[PDB]
């Protein structure tokens, strides 16, 4: 009878979802000696955040099948390690959404009404009612930056206050927004137009420090801004500058560029409400984490599908199909990048020898690629059913016996809402099974799918390759591989380069001007 | 009203103060989710009805006590009318307001 | 133990899907005396096409729950009668698709290669090999008119011959086409561009006689055309004219404007292959019809959902929600008509008192509305799950306690792929519960949702109402009700009229010119 | 009877031989043609002749004079057929060894409806270029500016590039490059290019 080791503060009621087919025991997880002694006969490991599920732990745990995190975060878990030992990692990704949206709302009201200061004022014994002045919400515009689950929640709640909602999110399809009854804007237009901004981005180099000194300066004077989402999404220093200057009326942070956080100058400003990362401190949110994580462990031990799965592990993937996960992920990205807007759907097409395999994971990989920009690292799998409902993009697979050129090739067709298609293809071959991008939109070639790749679609005149190469040489950037050809027909040609580092902004720009680029992108294929 | 209901539910002022004092007392707070919970509104003047409508969007059920309110209006507001007794038994939150008849209130 | 009366030639194996929870008996259906005697204790009635399930039959059958048709057609069934007696009608809508696509293909090849004539030639004992000349398919363009299931099937098959496929179908979303790897064209562009045309439209006044003398004249000389779909989709006389003139090379009809068909002049032309409605004459297609219809009867007797359902019956619908089916159907249409293109999704919104009801059927009604143009009559319900997969449009419901003005109102938001929204609202009120359209795109009013309604969106100058009214008066057409107002802002205003008959084409045109219409539509709301 | 499945390969393999030659600095002492993949099932001896054929067109000012022409210059041909191809469904490898011992390999394939002859390997670097038009190959020192200078000089000569692909080498401090030009390179430009990137080797050959 399977053993489930619970190594963090999780109530047995909280995990009654593990039927009576399992023997459930507890251990004091943050006690290394005890934990290590306990894990050896665990089929399953539930943890919260106090326990660190380490390289050492997993090696101590040779019978392990599922390490489950009752929570959203993964920082206390070394997934890559679990992946390499065949151990399925899972979490509770949607267990905190309600508590966190509610907190965003709390912070928003608390800040517009100077609550803790008022409350503090009666705590000192003074009637300073005349000094306060709050901001009314009815009829105001609210800008939601990032329209994932929590942002869509906050959007429903705030809307019922009679606010207008607008959002910025290049990773929600326009139709999906419109269904939510939300107007999609460039982050420029939101900034200008919102009276309230609540931010709801994951943390990704794409994202960190979005709302900088330069962004705050486009915001409506009188803005109230709220970040209950991540780390340093809104620049603490530039915020302090704007509060003080009065340009922004108030703020509410739940999260800090670096926590534990004790010494910010934000704690000296009054008009800024702050709380020590409370968004998910709710008995309801912790129980949900547990009950969810229980259910996943159940599915996982019945050998059923595990949609909350973070990675791959156990025979859930053939050795022959395994190496294609990463590459298809890469096509996904690329197809994302080469698209004008966000595709309404991915059509993963698998041809040649590979078509004999179970290749349904590869559809998950493509999506995981396409959405790299709003997905945090450790996550490798994601919920397709959930993704569709939330953002409104889907994916499907099609197998085909014949592969025209290579023995096996995977083609990713990003389809645009308007009927247009971008296609990107890769294969693997050779004793090393290296990843090669072998087609982009009718253009065949062979490039290692690795490193920093620059892609340009410019005007085909003599010496454009010159201009591009020579500009790069001046930036002191080496080219590892390059490829160009035709455009279907017309003006325009298409180049792709592996470089040894990023192209800095002014340089990136100079190139667009020198070949008169239509489009110019830079993508990290690692 | 909604502001105070959330401040009280997430302990905002106590929390904020912890930081003011330069302590990381994250581990000291534990709040209450509104979602799926039942909210008692006592008294249904325009404000109480507005509050009923703002809370329903948090996904809470709203019951309320107010014997002079148009029952129609209450069902349009998504509200289940109750006796003050039953509301008191079933409420996870309660927000009290001027009733429809000013000072039928006790 | 439930009784299932099988009144047509259907094998017991063919219906083994009805578990052993039922007592199954047969009757000679086309024998009225026998049938009528048999039906009284039937809980269920399976028929094929020989039996006519009549007003008389249903009244003879007071215990009846499901009349099931092993087939696609319904002409042998009076649904409206079954609807009014609470008896659920069902069919096998997708049982013939493979046999019918294959037949289309058969006809296409048979005709391009003059097969029956060749075969006929060896039957007379002559080696007339030198006289024949067939048409090769590889590299040719094939135009598929109507991209429903069968058309998408034919499209996959023909594509594997190395043909290019293009299609005309304003009721498949552009993204859906592109996923199928098909280029969507105006029927004008298809006509010009196709070397082969196979047609795949249902029969609807929208549709009957599409390919007329005028259409055939835009087709590529050398076209081969194939109609295996419906009745008279391609005009028999105009086809005969073009075959003879040589402009079209060959044809293949499986179906006839009026069948039984014995005397067409098409039977005198050689280059036209003809067969007596064989598309579904396949033992595989009949067994499928049966096995499908069995399964529906099973679900229906377990009181489970019945997706193949053609109508409503049994407590599957509250009396209070019942009268809203038709009206919401009407919004669906309207929302279709007022949209620039085909919506990617319908957002049915139900507000006020009605929000207390089970209103999931209303989502089905909206879709049934939107697709009226490609749906045959008797069908009232349709498969939403199937609709989405096929055409790529979805629908959802949202309930809301409050209705701003009326006590109950339903709003249908057609959302465009590009994020734009058309909204059309109706209610019912009064002792008669008459259907009223009460909002279109921010404009509130009160119009009976019945009759022939003309809608114009023209330029707002003085006397435009004059021009419109006076033009109509000259066409001798009476106006029963009218409504106009503002456009959001800008130039343009919007009028809606109930008329006692159609606006003929030249007149319809004259109006557009006189108010300088942007858009002008005419819709039958019955 | 040359088999319908093999016929399209003749011209391509001829091309492979023009490449193997123009690329060896010394005239070669052996030429080795290796068919791998589905083609191996066919009788491909006539491919050897094609290879030898290009190879001698590209060095000496028919299909039966060739084998005897070769022996008169010490060049020995060999051909190989193996079912295993590790990437393409079919691929032919032409291989020329020099007196000293230095190796050159070039590979082609056909695929698609228009079975287009593509070049695919040059010394263990992978490419997918149409084996047609005037191509310029360069083996040079891999450093920043290299690509810049090649382009700038070509541009400056009014020479337009149709397609091109370059890759850094397996282990050397060098890199390779293949460009399709719309016209030939005057000799001086060839030399100016060579000097500029420290070309170990430069060549222009015309794959009509």
From Swiss-Prot, chain D:
Residues 135-207 form the ACT domain. Catalyzes the reversible oxidation of 3-phospho-D-glycerate to 3-phosphonooxypyruvate, the first step of the phosphorylated L-serine biosynthesis pathway. Also catalyzes the reversible oxidation of 2-hydroxyglutarate to 2-oxoglutarate. Belongs to the D-isomer specific 2-hydroxyacid dehydrogenase family. This is D-3-phosphoglycerate dehydrogenase. It comes from Mycobacterium tuberculosis (strain CDC 1551 / Oshkosh).
